[model samples]
Target: GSSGSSGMVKEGWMVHYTSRDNLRKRHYWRLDSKCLTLFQNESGSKYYKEIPLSEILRISSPRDFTNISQGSNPHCFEIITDTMVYFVGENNGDSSHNPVLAATGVGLDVAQSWEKAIRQALMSGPSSG
Candidate 1:
């Protein structure tokens, strides 16, 4: 969860697919009233990027988006912020017979959970700081 002081509503750990070429990495979704940050375990273990929700432009779920051909599968969500456009994918039971090296990103349950919290956080408006 990003920032517990600024009225953090919901937060949890999830699998985040950084880019089309990247694998499914474990990430923590920290959604606060002011910002949304992705965390890692070590200094850079569970860290990707921290974005101020105040500058978030758009966030939505794409219909059928396979981040990349390298077993990226289909990303479940998309987040557009001031500096970058992030692609998030969830790995549930959607397995294939092709037997590709699959990565179970954020599961459907976790993905949906983060989405719900994000919507609520966005309602608080831009960052005050």
Candidate 2:
């Protein structure tokens, strides 16, 4: 039971990341005060993209893309921007209910926790230059 301080930075170790034109994979995710950055490598050296909080509109459950069965995959969530939706979900069986593998640091609640963190970051004031 602790109040969220301004210095609290939300970052995840290895999260499921998938997007249009890209195959499903795991990536390190970090949410700073102003932007959500995705990294291709665990060291965060391989930069992928920086999605400014301003560019995000909202977060929601991932949509069923086609005739796939619903609830068969209950681990996905989406971050919606003006032009695209980013999907984050559970990895393969390796990370199932395990902290070391899930590394989301939030375990089973990875997607939900990410949504909350993103929303909070967005609601916070812009960063100081």
For lDDT, the strongest prediction is: 2
Tens digit per residue, CA lDDT, model 1, 1-129: 654432465555666655444665665566776677777753557556777766667686586566666565466677776666667656555544322333222465455556656655676564457
Give the Cα lDDT of each candidate: 0.60, 0.61
What TM-score would every model get versus the actual structure? Answer: 0.63, 0.66
TM accuracy, model 1: 0.63
Can you write out model 2's per-residue Cα lDDT over 4-123, one digit (the tens) per residue? 653257666644434554445666777877677877777548688888888888876455443123323444556678878666654232334555544554344555566667777776
lDDT of 2 at 98: 58
The runs of at least 3 residues in candidate 1 whose Cα sits more than 4 Å from the true structure, single-residue gaps closed, are: 1-7, 42-48, 70-73, 94-105, 126-129
Model 2, 55: alpha-carbon shift in Å?
0.9
Clash tally, candidates in order:
6, 0
The count of residue-pair clashes in candidate 2 stands at 0
Alpha carbon deviation, residue 129, candidate 1 (Å): 18
